[PDB]
């Protein structure tokens, strides 16, 4: 179990590193005051949180007894902080032995006071408090199978609704065309993943 | 301009209504403790915020003088609250004359005390405070043109990096395959929109 978990964290870390690069590019090379830039930042932040959660789940699936220190290093605290755009001068003022696992364990008043000691902004504290709540909520082929099937049904219904409201127009709005492309793509990704899960279950 | 802005708000509202339905389904028909469910909820919340901001931009691009009350009704405050999963018992305890435009005008202490008086949770107050900050940051064909071109370059680089790290594998991880599909799709959506913007800028 430890070998499989460490391999998965390493794969997840490649996605994280790529995504952190793209997030920095959106934040520095794009117009941040633009509503599409903001949508894409939020979407990439969401993927990074998912990848970080999956690394943590991989580490916790192993019984605690001597899961290799390489395995215990995932997820990386700096990756999570960078996901929520914590200023790098604040990351440098963070204690070395402090981990995301510790933040999850403290109460809300202690989290905020710890962030303030590092110089975190009031805007930065609410980000991480919200992030810990979204993180804590999350912390199985058949359970993944059922959930993916519900998500396919909703995605099919979303596409049908979009087509009902905008289909067959000769000057379709760009904002509709973006949703059409994304959701028909999402349906194909989900249907593919469902086949992967039905095989794993079978 | 009032006619065009109202028409755009109407199109945007159709996307909002559809998206609110899908968000409710994710929250009620799916496993909310699942990390893919959470990603998809976050992604739909992001689109909803974008649609609401675009409605607000449409209303504000028109000079204020007698823009029709139908136009002034966008965005709808309940749509924004539902996007951040505010409990309906809290929505009912919200004053009628209270608008999203007013919350944007208040200081942080005023926002929190107003939310608390409606019975909002501590998790709901920080959620909406975070939402107002993300909202306030946002609140033009050539500016859209330039931004899309930067986003295309990053999307292309993201795909190239995905293929560098995972391309040519015989058992590719599902999580990679999901990213590959999404980003190659996103590149096609961006490049199509770039064509549309280059046409509008041209004329």
* 3-class secondary structure per residue, chain B: CHHHHHHHHHHHHHHHHHHHHHHHHHHHHCCCCCHHHHHHHHHHHHHHHHHHHHHHHHHHHCCCCCCCHHHHCCCCHHHHHHHCCCCHHHHHCCCCCCCHHHHHHCCHHHHHHHHHHCCCCHHHHHHHHHHHHHHHHHCCHHHHHHHHHHHHHHHHHHHHHHHHHHCCCCCCCHHHHHHHHHHHHHHHHHHHHHHHHHHHHHC
A with B: how many residue pairs have Cβ under 8 Å apart? 205
Q: What angle do CA A146, A148, A151 make, to 5 degrees?
A: 110
The owner of tokens 């009620």 is B28
Residues sharing a CB contact under 8 Å with residue A145, sequence separation 6 or more, in sequence order:
A194, A197, A198, A201
Interface test with B, best of A134, A185, A201 (most B CBs within 10 A): A185
Distance from CA of B153 to the nearest CA of A (A): 10
Resolution in A: 1.7
Distance from CA of B2 to the nearest CA of A (A): 18
B111 and B94 Cβ atoms separated by less than 8 Å: no
Identify whether A75 is preceded by a cis peptide bond (ω within 30 of 0). Answer: yes
Which residue in B has a C-alpha nearest to residue A13's C-alpha? B165
| Contact residues, chain A, for B19 at CB < 8 Å | 158
What does DSSP assign to residue A76? Answer: P
Distance from CA of A130 to the nearest CA of B (A): 6
Distance from CA of A32 to the nearest CA of B (A): 8
How far apart are the C-alpha atoms of B1 and A5, rounded to whole Å?
58
Q: Considering only CA atoms, which of B94, B93, B23, B95 is closest in space to residue B52?
A: B23
A74 and A99 Cβ atoms separated by less than 8 Å: no
How far apart are the C-alpha atoms of B141 and A174, rounded to whole Å?
13
| Contact residues, chain A, for B179 at CB < 8 Å | 15, 47
Identify whether B75 is preceded by a cis peptide bond (ω within 30 of 0). Answer: yes
In this complex, the residue of A123, A134, A161 whose CB is nearest that of residue B133 is A123
Residues sharing a CB contact under 8 Å with residue B167, sequence separation 6 or more, in sequence order:
none
Q: Please judge whether B11 and A45 are an interchain contact, meaning their C-beta atoms are less than 8 angstroms apart.
A: no
The end-to-end CA distance of chain B, in Å, is 18
Structure tokens at B130: 């975070």
How far apart are the C-alpha atoms of A52 and A72, rounded to whole Å?
13
| Contact residues, chain A, for B46 at CB < 8 Å | 38-39, 42-43, 46
**Maximum alpha-carbon separation in chain A:** 63
Distance from CA of A67 to the nearest CA of B (A): 22
Residues sharing a CB contact under 8 Å with residue A107, sequence separation 6 or more, in sequence order:
none
Query: HSE of B67 in the Cβ direction (CA atoms, 13 Å)?
Result: 21
Q: How far is residue B2 from each of residues B9, B64, B74, B132, measured CA to CA in Å? A: 10, 10, 12, 26
Residues sharing a CB contact under 8 Å with residue B15, sequence separation 6 or more, in sequence order:
A162, A175, A176, A179, B47, B51
Q: Please judge whether B26 and A151 are an interchain contact, meaning their C-beta atoms are less than 8 angstroms apart.
A: yes
Q: What angle do CA A121, A125, A129 make, to 5 degrees?
A: 170
B100 and B53 Cβ atoms separated by less than 8 Å: no
Query: HSE of B131 in the Cβ direction (CA atoms, 13 Å)?
Result: 28
The owner of tokens 């909310």 is B32
How far apart are the C-alpha atoms of B106 and B127, rounded to whole Å?
16
How far apart are the C-alpha atoms of A85 and B152, rounded to whole Å?
22
Structure tokens at B10: 């109407």
What does DSSP assign to residue B33? Answer: T
B106 and B40 Cβ atoms separated by less than 8 Å: no
Residues sharing a CB contact under 8 Å with residue A3, sequence separation 6 or more, in sequence order:
none
Q: How far is residue A126 from each of residues A121, A141, B72, B132, measured CA to CA in Å? A: 9, 35, 31, 11
How far apart are the C-alpha atoms of A47 and A112, rounded to whole Å?
25
**Maximum alpha-carbon separation in chain B:** 63
How far apart are the C-alpha atoms of A111 and A122, rounded to whole Å?
12
How far apart are the C-alpha atoms of A147 and A140, rounded to whole Å?
11
In which region does residue B59 sit, left (phi positive, over 0), alpha (psi from -120 to 50) or beta (all else)? alpha
The owner of tokens 């041209």 is B202
Q: Please judge whether B122 and A108 are an interchain contact, meaning their C-beta atoms are less than 8 angstroms apart.
A: yes
Q: Please judge whether B181 and A178 are an interchain contact, meaning their C-beta atoms are less than 8 angstroms apart.
A: no
Q: How far is residue B58 from each of residues A58, A96, B5, B7, B188, measured CA to CA in Å? A: 46, 48, 5, 9, 26
Torsions phi, psi for B86 (to 5 deg): -65, 130
Interface test with A, best of B14, B55, B107 (most A CBs within 10 A): B14
Rg of chain B's alpha carbons, rounded to an integer? Answer: 20
A85 and A127 Cβ atoms separated by less than 8 Å: yes
A129-142 as b/e, with b when 16 or more CB fall inside 10 Å?
A: bbbbebbeebeeee
Q: Mind giving me the DSSP string for A172-201? A: --HHHHHHHHHHHHHHHHHHHHHHHHHHHH
Q: How far is residue B133 from each of residues B104, B108, B128, B129, measured CA to CA in Å? A: 9, 10, 8, 6
Residues sharing a CB contact under 8 Å with residue B14, sequence separation 6 or more, in sequence order:
A165, A166
Strands (DSSP E) found in chain A: none
Q: What angle do CA B35, B41, B42 make, to 5 degrees?
A: 90
Q: Write out the H or E segment, with its range, that includes residue A77.
A: helix A77-83
Which residue in A has a C-alpha nearest to residue B126's C-alpha? A126
């Amino acid at each position: 179990a430890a070998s499989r978990a460490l391999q998965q964290c390493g794969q997840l870390q490649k996605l994280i590193d790529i995504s952190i690069g793209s997030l920095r590019g959106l934040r520095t090379k794009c117009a941040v005051s633009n509503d599409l830039t903001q949508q894409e930042i939020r979407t990439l932040e969401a993927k990074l949180v998912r990848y970080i959660c999956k690394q943590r789940q991989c580490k916790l699936s192993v019984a605690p007894g001597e899961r290799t220190p390489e395995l215990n290093s995932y997820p990386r605290f700096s990756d999570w902080l960078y996901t929520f755009n914590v200023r790098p001068e604040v990351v440098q003022e963070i204690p070395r032995d402090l981990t995301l696992d510790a933040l999850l364990e403290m109460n809300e008043a202690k989290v905020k006071e710890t962030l303030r000691r590092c110089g975190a902004s009031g805007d930065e504290c609410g980000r991480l408090q919200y992030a810990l709540t979204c993180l804590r909520k999350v912390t199985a082929i058949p359970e993944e199978v059922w959930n993916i099937k519900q998500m396919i049904k909703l995605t099919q219904e979303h596409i049908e609704a979009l087509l009902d409201k905008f289909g067959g127009e000769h000057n379709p709005p760009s904002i509709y065309l973006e949703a059409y492309e994304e959701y028909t793509s999402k349906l194909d990704a989900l249907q593919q993943r469902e086949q992967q899960l039905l095989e794993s279950l079978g």
